[PDB]
């Protein structure tokens, strides 16, 4: 199956955003991460907003929006 189920989605970590962390912009929504955002982390270390990448990861594909790496 190309898409991910919700139980597979919950196994990917969720990082609370502190102002000093390693990420800055959500590659999807193009906005800057704000202090306190929840971020979904991928196996390839690419991170996005949960509200942004979870719909892509579940409704459409299970690959990274940036590096096309499948999420297992």
């Amino acid at each position: 199956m190309n898409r991910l189920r919700k139980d597979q989605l919950k196994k990917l970590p969720v990082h609370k955003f502190k102002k000093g962390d390693e990420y800055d912009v959500c590659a999807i929504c193009l906005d800057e991460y704000e202090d306190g955002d929840k971020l979904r982390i991928l196996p390839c270390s690419h991170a996005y907003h949960c509200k942004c990448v979870d719909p892509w990861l579940t409704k459409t594909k299970k690959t990274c929006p940036v590096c096309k790496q499948k999420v297992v």
């Binding site: 999807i28 193009l30 990448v53 940036v66």
Partner: protein, 148 residues
Amino acid sequence: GMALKRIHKELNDLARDPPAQCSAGPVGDDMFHWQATIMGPNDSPYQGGVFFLTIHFPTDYPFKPPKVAFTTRIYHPNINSNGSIKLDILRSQWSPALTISKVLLSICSLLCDPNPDDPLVPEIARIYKTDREKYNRIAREWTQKYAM
């Protein structure tokens, strides 16, 4: 509704940074319908021409790719009589990280470097493989006739 918000943010980013190679904007007030102009790359048969393109953004953009087509006629292996483009990122390789700016850049690069492997028009790809002077000359002709 991410689509309207992101399209506006993209138009703002294009206002702050204008790419010399192309420029796009909403045709009227329909933010989901844009018009783009790609300039012909230098030292290419399309040099000197300006090619117009129509763009339609889906309602759940950026999760679905935009419909991009050429209105100005062009003699290119991967571009149709009606103007469709055989670009992977518009079909199979779409990603939510892609912007309309990156799409226009990919189209400019496809103009600079046509892809012979899978062509939309086999005749032009055969010309490119066999006779490049004829390809360059016919594209110059078409650019003079339509792009100007």
